[PDB]
Amino acid sequence: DDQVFEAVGTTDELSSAIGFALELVTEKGHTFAEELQKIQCTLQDVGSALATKYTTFKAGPILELEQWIDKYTSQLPPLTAFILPGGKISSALHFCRAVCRRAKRRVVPLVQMGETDANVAKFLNRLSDYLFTLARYAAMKEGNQEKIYM
Amino acid sequence: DDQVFEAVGTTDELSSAIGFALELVTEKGHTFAEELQKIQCTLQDVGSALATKYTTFKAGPILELEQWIDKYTSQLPPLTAFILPGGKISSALHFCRAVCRRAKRRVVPLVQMGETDANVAKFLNRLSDYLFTLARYAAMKEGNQEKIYM
Amino acid sequence: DDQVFEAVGTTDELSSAIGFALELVTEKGHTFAEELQKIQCTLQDVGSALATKYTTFKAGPILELEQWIDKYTSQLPPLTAFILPGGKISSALHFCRAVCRRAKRRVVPLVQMGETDANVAKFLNRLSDYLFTLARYAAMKEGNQEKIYM
Ligand code: B12
Ligand code: B12
Ligand code: B12
Ligand SMILES: C[C@H]1O[C@@H](n2cnc3c(N)ncnc32)[C@H](O)[C@@H]1O
Ligand SMILES: C[C@H]1O[C@@H](n2cnc3c(N)ncnc32)[C@H](O)[C@@H]1O
Ligand SMILES: C[C@H]1O[C@@H](n2cnc3c(N)ncnc32)[C@H](O)[C@@H]1O
Ligand SMILES: [K+]
Ligand SMILES: [Mg+2]
Predict the structure, then answer these.
(1) I need a surface site. Which of A24, B101, C64, C97 has the fewest CB within 10 A?
(2) C23: nearest Cα among B129, B34, A117, B86
(3) In terms of C-beta density within 10 A (0-12 exposed, 13-18 middle, 19 or more buried), how is residue C118 classed?
(4) Residue B9: CB within 6 Å of ligand 4?
C-alpha cells in the first residue's frame, strides 16, 4: 500500500525533525532531552505497528505523554489565544509539532481501514499537544515572551 | 473535510518553519525580522479563512507583500537562471519557500471547490516570491555569492 | 498535472533542506560539502526531467552516488538495527533523508504513468541511502555514538 509508505515515511520525517530539535536542546542543556529521545523510541514502535489483523500498540506511551503534558502545562501561564510559533528550541519544536500533525493525518486512513491500531493515531494526537506545550515551556524557561496576534 | 486539515496543517507548518528562520534572522540582527513576524500574523488569518459561503480574505497583505518584493528585487543583481538554494538564513528561507509552495498546493482544491477566497492562494503565491527574493537579499547582504549551475 | 507540481515541489523542498544541511557542514569544515552541492545540481536536472514522451535522465549520477555510498559504508561499523536519527549535521541529514524519501514517493505516479524516466526514481532511492550513510559518517567523525533502541 502507498498509504503505508506515506504514513511510515512521515513518522520517519517526524523522528528526524525531533532529532534535530534534540541537538539544539542538548546544546543549551535543557533537561527534557531524554523525553524527546524516548519519543523517538516510541516512534520506532509506531513505524513497526504501521507496517505489518493489525499489530496491537499498547496505550502505555499515551499515558506517559499525558503525564508529561500535565507536568508542563501546570507550569505555564494561562493561554486562550493562538501564539506565533519563541527561541530556537521552541520554534524547532513548533516545526516538529506541525510535522507530527501531518504524520497523524497520514495515519488516519490506515486506522479507518482497520489496518493499524487506533492507539497509533491517539499517540500522535497527544504527541502534538506535548510538543506545543514543551515549546511554550522552553520559551518560558528562556525568558522569551509569548507573542499573541490580535 | 480532510482537505481543510491538510491545508491548515500546512500553513501551520509554514508559519513554524518561518518561526525558526526568524530565530536565525534576529541572531544576526537583520532588520527584516519584523516582516517575517507580520507574515506569521497573516498566516494566522489565512488559517482562520481556510476553516469556516467562504470567509473573505482581504487583498491588503498581498499588496503589502508586492511592495516588499519590489523593495528587495530592486536591490539584487539580474538573474535569468536557477540558483542552488547562500548562508544559514538564506537556506532556511529557501526551505520556508518550498514549504510555502506546498501550502499553496494544498489550498488549490479549496479555492476550486469555492470553499475559500481565491486571495488566500494569491497570497501564498506571492509569499513564495517574497521568500525567494528575501533569501537572495540575505545572501547578498552577507557577501555570499549566488551559485548558478550550468 | 497536479502530480508534476507535487513532484517538482518536493524535489525543490529536498534541495532546500540540503542547502541548510550544507551550511552546517561547511561551518564545521567537513570535506563532503561539495558532494552535497553536486547533488543539488543533479536535483535541478531532476526538476527539469520531471517537468517537460519523457526526458531521458542519464544514469551517471546514480553510479556516482553508488560510488560515494561504498566509500562511506566501508568506513562504518556494522549495523543490523534501526538507529535513532547524532549531532547537528547528522540529524539535519536524517531530516534531508526523510524529505528525500517523500520526494521519491511523489515521483512514483509519474514513472508509473510513463511521464518521467524511471532513473529519476532510482536516483532518489539511492540518494536516500547516501544521506543515511553520510549522516552515520558525520556522526562517527564527530565521536557521537550510534544510539540503537531495543
Ligand atoms: C482552524 C484551527 C486551527 C488551525 C489554524 C488556527 C489559525 N487560525 O491560525 C491550526 C491547525 C493551525 C490550529 C492549531 C492549533 N490549535 Co486549533 N483550532 C482551530 C479552530 C478549529 C478554529 C480557530 C479559528 O480560526 N478561529 C477563528 C479566529 C478568528 O478566532 P480567534 O479570535 O483567534 O479566537 C480563537 C482563540 O482564542 C482560540 N482559543 C481559545 N482558547 C485557546 C487556548 C489555546 C492554547 C489556543 C492555542 C487557542 C485558544 O479559540 C478561538 C478559536 O475559535 C479552533 C476551534 C473552533 N474555534 O471551532 C481550534 C482550537 C482553537 N485549536 C486548539 C488547539 C489545542 C490548537 C493547538 C495547540 C493544537 C496543537 N497541539 O498543535 C495548535 C495551536 C497553534 C498556535 N500557534 O497557537 C484548541 C484550543 C483550546 C484547547 N487548549 O483545547 C481549539 C479551541 C480546538 C479544540 N481543541 O477544542 N488550530
Ligand atoms: C519546472 C520549473 C521549476 C521547478 C524545477 C526547476 C528546476 N529545473 O530545478 C521548481 C518548482 C523547483 C521551480 C522553482 C522556481 N521557479 Co520555476 N519554472 C519551472 C519551469 C516550468 C521549467 C524550468 C526548466 O526546467 N527548464 C529547463 C532547464 C534545462 O532550462 P534552463 O537551462 O535551466 O533555463 C531556465 C532558466 O534560465 C529559467 N529562468 C529564466 N529567467 C529566470 C529568472 C529566475 C529568477 C529563475 C529562478 C529562473 C529563470 O528559464 C529557463 C526555464 O525554461 C519554468 C518555465 C518554463 N521554462 O516553461 C519556470 C520558471 C523558470 N520558474 C520561475 C521562477 C519564478 C521560479 C521560482 C523563483 C519560484 C519561487 N518563488 O519559488 C523558483 C526558483 C528556484 C531556484 N532555486 O532558483 C520563472 C523565472 C522567471 C521569473 N522571475 O518570472 C519561470 C520562467 C516561470 C514563470 N514564472 O514564468 N520552477
Ligand atoms: C517499515 C520499515 C521501515 C520504516 C519504519 C522502521 C521502524 N520500525 O521505525 C522506515 C520508513 C522509517 C524505514 C527506515 C529505513 N529503513 Co527500513 N524497513 C522497514 C521494514 C519494512 C520493517 C521494519 C520493522 O518494523 N521490523 C519490525 C521490528 C520490530 O523489527 P526489529 O526488531 O527492529 O528488527 C529490524 C532491524 O534489525 C532491521 N535491520 C536488519 N538489518 C539492518 C540494517 C540496517 C542499517 C537497518 C537500519 C535496519 C536493519 O531488520 C528488522 C526489520 O525486520 C524492513 C524490512 C522487513 N523487516 O520486512 C525494512 C528495512 C529494515 N529497512 C531498511 C533500511 C535500508 C532502511 C533505511 C536505512 C532506508 C533509508 N535510506 O532511509 C531507513 C533506516 C531508518 C533508521 N533510523 O535507522 C533495510 C535494512 C537492511 C539494509 N541495509 O538493506 C530493510 C531490511 C529493508 C530492505 N532494504 O531489505 N524502514
Ligand atoms: C486545532 C484545530 O486543528 C485542526 N486539526 C486537528 N487535528 C489536525 C491535524 N492532525 N492536522 C491538521 N489540522 C488538525 C482541527 O480543526 C482542530 O480543531
Ligand atoms: C516555477 C514553476 O514551478 C511550478 N509551480 C508553480 N506553483 C507551484 C507550487 N505551488 N508548487 C510547486 N510547483 C509550482 C510551475 O511549473 C512554475 O512554472
Ligand atoms: C525501509 C522500508 O521503508 C519503506 N520504504 C521504501 N521506500 C520508501 C519511501 N520512498 N518512503 C517511505 N517508506 C519507504 C519500505 O517498507 C522499506 O522496506
Ligand atoms: K506532504
Ligand atoms: Mg542551527
Answers:
(1) C64
(2) B86
(3) middle
(4) yes
- Per the structure, the count of domains in chain C is 1
Nearest ligand by distance to the CA of C127? 3
**Ligand 2 pocket, residues with Cβ under 6 angstroms:** B 79-83, 85, 97, 101, 128-129, 132; C 8-9, 12, 44, 47-48, 51
Q: Is B47 in the pocket of ligand 4 (CB under 6 A)?
A: no
The range of the structural domain enclosing residue B46 comes to 1-150
| Method by which this entry was solved | X-ray
Nearest to C98 by CA among B105, A103, B67: A103
Alpha helix (H) ranges present in chain C? 2-27, 33-50, 60-73, 88-112, 118-141
Answer yes or no: is the C-beta of A9 below 6 A from any ligand 3 atom: yes
Q: Cβ atoms within 10 A of the Cβ of C79, count?
A: 12
3-state helix, strand, coil split of chain C in percent (to 5) is 70, 0, 30
Q: Which residue of A has its CA nearest to C21?
A: A20
What does this entry list as its resolution, in Å? 2.1
